Design a protein around this ligand. Structure first.
Ligand code: EGI
Ligand code: MN
Ligand code: MN
Ligand code: ZN
Ligand code: ZN
Length: 145
């Protein structure tokens, strides 16, 4: 394709644990990351959805990272929509998604500027690790954990 994500993590590269949370009643949310080299960022968002905050967190990781990046998301949708866009691009019977088109397009913009990207899904879980840390940061004031 016009790109292909890595099949396994990029050894040596900084890892961004991304997450977003939104509250449906208010459309308020947060998106951000923590990294294994001690970086972290959280942004507040309005007029948003959980899916958009998860994509926004990936966007921030691509914006703030170097040429090779590992990204761990707990959003099956964010992973799928991005992967399908990559694999199905400038190809035959693919039709652009309806929702979140602008944001996914901006993510794709960032992605083609990278040299290597590993994007993996994990389920949300308990513990003290990376997904847990960023979840708590974006959930504060948005949802009870
Ligand atoms: C308040 C939301 O806290 C979160 O970060 C997430 C919860 C569940 C996710 N998942 O199942 O795609 S992310
Ligand atoms: Mn999440
Ligand atoms: Mn989470
Ligand atoms: Zn608003
Ligand atoms: Zn490189």
């Amino acid at each position: 394709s016009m790109y292909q994500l890595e099949k396994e993590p990029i050894v040596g590269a900084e890892t961004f644990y991304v997450d977003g949370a939104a509250n449906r009643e208010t459309k308020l949310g947060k998106a951000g990351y923590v990294t294994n080299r001690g970086r972290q960022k959280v942004v507040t968002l309005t007029d948003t959805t959980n899916q958009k905050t998860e994509l926004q967190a990936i966007y921030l990781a691509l914006q703030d990272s170097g040429l090779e990046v590992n990204i761990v998301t707990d959003s099956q949708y964010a992973l799928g929509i991005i992967t399908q866009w990559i694999h199905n691009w400038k190809k035959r019977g693919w039709k652009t998604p309806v929702k979140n088109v602008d944001l996914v397009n901006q993510i794709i913009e960032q992605l083609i500027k990278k040299e290597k990207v590993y994007l993996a899904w994990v389920p949300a879980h308990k513990g003290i690790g990376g997904n847990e840390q960023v979840d708590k940061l974006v959930s504060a004031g948005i949802r009870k954990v």
